[PDB]
Amino acid sequence: MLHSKNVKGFLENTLKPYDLHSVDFKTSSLQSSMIITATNGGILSYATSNEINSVNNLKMMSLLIKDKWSEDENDTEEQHSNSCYPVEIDSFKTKIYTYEMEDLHTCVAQIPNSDLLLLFIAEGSFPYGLLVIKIERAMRELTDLFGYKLG
């Protein structure tokens, strides 16, 4: 089974911004943080930094991101792309893809050996490297959701 409250708390915690103290470099929070399916692309769980219209728009954006990701997961040509960051944690291989949606930076990563995806959307000023590190450290703590498939 699944627990919506703990996943909601995790997605709310992944909306936390960065405030560096050694170097004065403040970053804004992410626009949205959600977990979606790898089959239909609809929202399993979601969280926003800051109502029905935004939920429908976020579902549309999740559908668009999964539609773009489906062809990228099934393509082996041009595999040495600069926007792909395939990380392997705990002997589980996955592929992370970053995309630009007009003025939005959207980073998606398939949870390894499972039919789920994790998506972080931030503003255009957000750096891509910090998003990659954020999604890597987020996937590091999601070992309990490994091997989960839809029924």
């Binding site: 170097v23 470099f25 926007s83 960051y85 750096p127 490297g129 990659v132």
Partner: protein, 67 residues
């Protein structure tokens, strides 16, 4: 120190501070600059000294005034 730019081997910005916050387009050039065994490099351009340090496949560039 005028600013810092953190970028991995792909060149994507992890952090952009100072004048380097508005000097991103040189990163594609700086991928063609060789380093030493320790990763330290001092490259001069646009009357500025850039200190490059590569650790764990991440190059950090620090801008300093030449004068």
């Amino acid at each position: 120190i005028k600013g810092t730019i953190a970028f991995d081997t792909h060149g994507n910005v992890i952090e952009s501070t100072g004048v380097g916050s508005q000097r991103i387009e040189d990163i594609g050039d700086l991928s063609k600059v060789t380093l030493d065994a320790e990763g330290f490099a001092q490259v001069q351009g646009d009357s500025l000294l850039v200190h490059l340090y590569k650790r764990n496949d991440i190059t950090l560039a620090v801008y300093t005034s030449a004068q």
